Amino acid sequence: RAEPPHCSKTPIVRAQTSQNAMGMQMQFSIGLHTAVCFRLYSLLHTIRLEKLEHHHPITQRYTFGIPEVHASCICECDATSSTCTAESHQFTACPEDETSSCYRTFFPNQTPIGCSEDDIPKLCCDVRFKPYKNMTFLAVKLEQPTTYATFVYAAYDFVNGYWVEKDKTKIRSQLDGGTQDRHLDQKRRISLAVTAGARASHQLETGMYFSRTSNGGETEELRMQPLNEITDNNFDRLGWYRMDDSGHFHVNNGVVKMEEIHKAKVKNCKEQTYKSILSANHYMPGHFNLTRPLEVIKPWIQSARIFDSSLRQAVVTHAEGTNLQISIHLESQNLVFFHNASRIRDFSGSIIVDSKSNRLFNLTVYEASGKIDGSVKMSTGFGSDTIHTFTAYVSDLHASNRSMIIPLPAIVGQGARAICLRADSMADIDKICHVIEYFESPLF
Amino acid sequence: RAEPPHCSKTPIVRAQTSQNAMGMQMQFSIGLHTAVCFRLYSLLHTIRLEKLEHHHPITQRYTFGIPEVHASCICECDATSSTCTAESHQFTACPEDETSSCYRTFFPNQTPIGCSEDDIPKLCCDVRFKPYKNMTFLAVKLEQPTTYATFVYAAYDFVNGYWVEKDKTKIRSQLDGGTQDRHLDQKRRISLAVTAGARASHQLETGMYFSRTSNGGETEELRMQPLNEITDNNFDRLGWYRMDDSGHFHVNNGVVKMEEIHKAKVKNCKEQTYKSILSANHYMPGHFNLTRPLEVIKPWIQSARIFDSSLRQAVVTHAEGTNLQISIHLESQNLVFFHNASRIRDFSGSIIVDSKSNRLFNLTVYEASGKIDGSVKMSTGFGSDTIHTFTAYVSDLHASNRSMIIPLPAIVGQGARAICLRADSMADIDKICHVIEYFESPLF
Amino acid sequence: RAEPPHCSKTPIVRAQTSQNAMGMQMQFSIGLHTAVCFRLYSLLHTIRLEKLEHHHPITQRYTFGIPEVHASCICECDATSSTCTAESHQFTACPEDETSSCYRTFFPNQTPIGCSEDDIPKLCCDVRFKPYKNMTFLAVKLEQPTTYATFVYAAYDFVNGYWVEKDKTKIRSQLDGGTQDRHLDQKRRISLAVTAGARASHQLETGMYFSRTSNGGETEELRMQPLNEITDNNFDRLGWYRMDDSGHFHVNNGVVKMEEIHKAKVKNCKEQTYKSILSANHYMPGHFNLTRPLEVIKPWIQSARIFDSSLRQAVVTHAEGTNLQISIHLESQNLVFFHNASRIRDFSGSIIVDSKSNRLFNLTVYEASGKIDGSVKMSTGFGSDTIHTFTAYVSDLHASNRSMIIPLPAIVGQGARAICLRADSMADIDKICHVIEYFESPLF
Ligand SMILES: *[C@@H]1O[C@H](CO)[C@@H](O[C@@H]2O[C@H](CO)[C@@H](O[C@@H]3O[C@H](CO)[C@@H](O)[C@H](O)[C@@H]3O)[C@H](O)[C@H]2NC(C)=O)[C@H](O)[C@H]1NC(C)=O
Ligand SMILES: *[C@@H]1O[C@H](CO)[C@@H](O[C@@H]2O[C@H](CO)[C@@H](O[C@@H]3O[C@H](CO)[C@@H](O)[C@H](O)[C@@H]3O)[C@H](O)[C@H]2NC(C)=O)[C@H](O)[C@H]1NC(C)=O
Ligand SMILES: *[C@@H]1O[C@H](CO)[C@@H](O[C@@H]2O[C@H](CO)[C@@H](O[C@@H]3O[C@H](CO)[C@@H](O)[C@H](O)[C@@H]3O)[C@H](O)[C@H]2NC(C)=O)[C@H](O)[C@H]1NC(C)=O
Ligand SMILES: *[C@@H]1O[C@H](CO)[C@@H](O)[C@H](O)[C@H]1NC(C)=O
Ligand SMILES: *[C@@H]1O[C@H](CO)[C@@H](O)[C@H](O)[C@H]1NC(C)=O
Ligand SMILES: *[C@@H]1O[C@H](CO)[C@@H](O)[C@H](O)[C@H]1NC(C)=O
Ligand SMILES: *[C@@H]1O[C@H](CO)[C@@H](O)[C@H](O)[C@H]1NC(C)=O
Ligand SMILES: *[C@@H]1O[C@H](CO)[C@@H](O)[C@H](O)[C@H]1NC(C)=O
Ligand SMILES: *[C@@H]1O[C@H](CO)[C@@H](O)[C@H](O)[C@H]1NC(C)=O
């Protein structure tokens, strides 16, 4: 059951520690989602880089909805009539649905269609807003993150004909600063010093993100769509329809802004017919479309969520990330690193350009384990020139079936082509080649 | 007095230089704010990574203020009266306080409150703007930076029972490109080659920043608050009230924009009472709040200033940054690296979540020096599981009292918990544990 | 003709591969635009890091123009006249130049200049838009990139008194993830494993970019200027004048927005004289200025283009970038690395602060090759303190004349100063010093 992970083929650098006036270190690079194994001269010590996370501080929060809008207008032929005035309809709310918010607009200087030729009619409206399908979202401002690696340390013994887990701990290490060090084992003999070369290869930009909220205010996967900061009131972007301290929704500064967004005009004054539109985005009917979550659209994002109910940090878990630098240090004793052979029976897949322009090789490896080297060819011919080389990693100790996404450079354009896969150290004779089809989704 | 810094425990890699058809290098990683020491086989050579700076080019500048606003309105009952017209009050400045700027607005189609029932009154206003407390700020657009490390090289001799500084130079090295090399010592025997793994762990985003300015235009610590670029005229953001080539302030395109931002309505025409507001942000009274400087709110920022009076570059000094890669190269001779022991008597502190959502351990170490390894526990019990491990560095050669900020991952939530500190290489018996209290400031 | 590149002086680290239960690697850092050479113990194997590219996915596209604008207005003295009404001129297009787009505006409540004192005139306009000089541009939204290094591998034999190229291949390697490996030579004996320390030192921010388009929709060098996203309709930014599925240009939501951007007022009603302006940016006459391409203004950008006619990815080629980490691995045999001597006859140049605040040393080296170490001095005196040290690389095997841009830190302010250059390993006696002039272009 509990077994060592695939032990990765790793070059080891022996570094000598500086002298104390009154010591060898084993240095190596470790890949995200991979493990490195060693014995101390007996337990098999394994270190797996399990996670790469950005912890973004949340500097603003507000709750918003998507309004369902209806405008009800009345026309008056006589400009001097007590019905329809700037008093009652210019910069004022409708007089007192409990969930509705209602703002008034005034349109004098209308054309006398349905009136006398000497009349200058006036149109007066109530612009009603209700939350569409009672949807609620939390808007958050995310700022520059702190970075953390999660390592899983596990020591194994092979007794009674099976591997047995002798010790297991999760280790957390901040990556933005200098070398971070601590004891690895329960006996405190081995230490793990973690050094990042620099900032994680990917990062979510500073700005506005959002999550759908439940009745209890429970959040989910973060989404990105043009969204107002707390101090912004741009009607082309999300967040102009906000919930107050009570669960009541309002058009942000609606009393004053209504005359800027509500566009209306008389068709026939007597018939009480008129033209009316909202000059804004993100409302119902017909002006709202919800983006899919960040994790669905970004191959590099495994997850992007708000950490807990205190709503202080958002955590982005990376599916892709550069290697970390490790230094293993310690009676007189020697460390020996071990790796497992890599293997592959077959593969299948396709070359994809998705609706967001991600150019990927969607790959499934069969009965595979460890380091798999791949070559993308110029055409369908297995002997045609190589235009791209990559390496995929399968962390399972035993031959497993696994699906993965391999980013592809732009040179890998339209059309079917050959892709050849080969397990690390295997001869060219043991490569697997297949003609792989191309599928391009239009930009949506 | 002038003494070597704490010599950091450093793993050294011996690299062999490629052959010239017609040479050993000492390689190591160096942490920001730390020093590495060596002897050449006698002077004690010390290299300290003193600074990490981003030099951002300034691509736009303009001077702005915070206006103090007052609207003075007059009402006229008779729509055809020569008093209050589109001629005199629509898209025009007030006729000619020397520092004031005055823009006019026109509101016809008013309700006859205080007039006859057949009247259609008109309201006319003067909207006056003055600089609040004569405050001046420089808006700057900062673009992608160039990166520089500052090293302090200092060679020491121990004669007459004391250390004496034999040589000292400041060394500057660009980090964005390839390996940068130069001679270290006065005798030109030792060379320092600096290689960054990649871009500095933190960076100030491209965009608009600002500084308060004095009478002489002297700048200070940079601040970040939504602010218009030179070509933008968004009234929800700072910078719409700009100073011209003379020290005169104007509402940017005020003559044309006034009718969009000034919202007014008659209360009683005869009584000369009316409602009036400005639909904009960042003005007085009651619509202005100044953000604290970037250095105060961002733990990673030690300083963010405009370099000099030419106003061409902004310099961001980093409080946190990844390690740099060093190669020391050179008659036949050998380099020996030395380190000092690490020590700690005690510590105090608290776990803090500030008003900007920075999750930190505010730490004070007592009589400490060198490398200090810390463990954050699951609960108040000193033997409860470790949820986070970190390392702090104290660069003082002698036991010193120092305060520092340690970023914490989100798993370190609410509540008091134990934190244990231990100097590098000390036995578990020499660790110091304390129950540390939690304090969370609400989001402001 | 076809000759090896300059073989760079490189420190080599020998790493030992982990053991397989059933192997030495040669590790080194390689600089962008440089080459490393070795022999296997005979062919001279050369690896050149030729390119660093970001492949940005394009998530939005739209075609836009720069409108040439003309407003034609008519005044009517009598407010009740059938000529000039809200019906015909408020929120409507002009009635049906084939390329023109025409939107109407209505301005009642005018002052009776040229009318009777009891008249309340009305102004009616046609606001016409045509594409200025038939210019077309493609707006693109660029998102976070994938990173690729291009290596040129070339093996040389020296027979018949000349170098002869025995093999040459271009190698592509993704940098965002883990170690990428493949065979280097035709015989598959040597392998090249590429590891990036982290994300490329520079990156183009997520956002809106544009390119001029030809008749066939052919793109060119990308430019950056405030530009609307597809869902934005901000008149202070580019892209509000868009081309539809036919080659026809429209003011985005022009029918509704016209009353917000067209500002007009009667001068004399009878004379048919009036004031008229567009409250917007990026139109002709007098309100349009085109930024120079990204590659021209950013020293770090060699090129920034749309890859091909499918318009799915934009490719940014970097002129500056950090080193990559290489591991060369393989019968029992040994790898020996070789380098060429560095040389320089003379140099010329100037210190420049351009119109975009880039602080650079514009340098020309004469009869130079390899590694050139430079020192920037405090004053004009050749013996004055060094305020900055840098290293430039010339990849040509033979002494060549080459121009380059060296970024300078802000400490290198105004005024003439000495700069001293010296080829790697040359004695201080062989340095070349010149007093170098300062030229600062004002901020434009
Ligand atoms: C992956 O690599 C590790 C080495 O890094 C392999 O570990 C080896 O596991 C075998 C058992 O599978 C151990 O062999 C011996 O087993 C007999 C009982 O059959 C026992 O009497 C011996 O004392 C011994 O334990 C061997 O010690 C162990 N090697 C090391 C260096 O730890 C592992 O088998 C590899 N896994 C796969 C799936 O290839
Ligand atoms: C930090 O580490 C350095 C070594 O890296 C220590 O330097 C050592 O300093 C002592 C003096 O404190 C030197 O010892 C000797 O002093 C006597 C006079 O008392 C003199 O006659 C001898 O010739 C000799 O200089 C010693 O040479 C020096 N060691 C090295 C390798 O440089 C330093 O003491 C440490 N500092 C602290 C505060 O622990
Ligand atoms: C740059 O460095 C390389 C070494 O890394 C130099 O390569 C050397 O090239 C010479 C020829 O220029 C080779 O020498 C010999 O030439 C004679 C014929 O004149 C021939 O009979 C010998 O068998 C031999 O090839 C030498 O082997 C080669 N060295 C290596 C190690 O490859 C190159 O000359 C340098 N270039 C410059 C411009 O300095
Ligand atoms: C949910 O929507 C319904 C109408 O569909 C409404 O009656 C109800 O009050 C809304 N829920 C809340 C919590 O307001
Ligand atoms: C990749 O292919 C698998 C089938 O092997 C499919 O289930 C999966 O959804 C595909 N993923 C993408 C991103 O195309
Ligand atoms: C400063 O403010 C005062 C009023 O408080 C004003 O009289 C003075 O002119 C202002 N200073 C300048 C330099 O304009
Ligand atoms: C940290 O604690 C010290 C007292 O030891 C205090 O002076 C300092 O202001 C605190 N800093 C922060 C950021 O909380
Ligand atoms: C180009 O501009 C001319 C006027 O200068 C116009 O006649 C022509 O129709 C425009 N070209 C296209 C393709 O519309
Ligand atoms: C640098 O100087 C050369 C002349 O040696 C000139 O042709 C080139 O345009 C200059 N480049 C810059 C960016 O100033």
TrEMBL record, chains A, B, C:
Coiled coil ranges: none
Disulphide bridges: 7-37, 73-125, 75-269, 77-115, 84-124, 94-102, 420-433
Gene Ontology MF annotations: fusogenic activity; identical protein binding; kinase activity
Glycosylation sites: 134, 362, 401
GO biological process: cell-cell fusion; egg-laying behavior; embryonic body morphogenesis; locomotion; morphogenesis of an epithelium; nematode male tail mating organ morphogenesis; nematode male tail tip morphogenesis; nematode pharyngeal muscle development
A single GO cellular-component term on record: cytoplasm
Record has DNA damage as a keyword: no
Keywords from the named record: Kinase, Membrane, Signal, Transferase, Transmembrane, Transmembrane helix
Protein name, entry field: EFF-1A
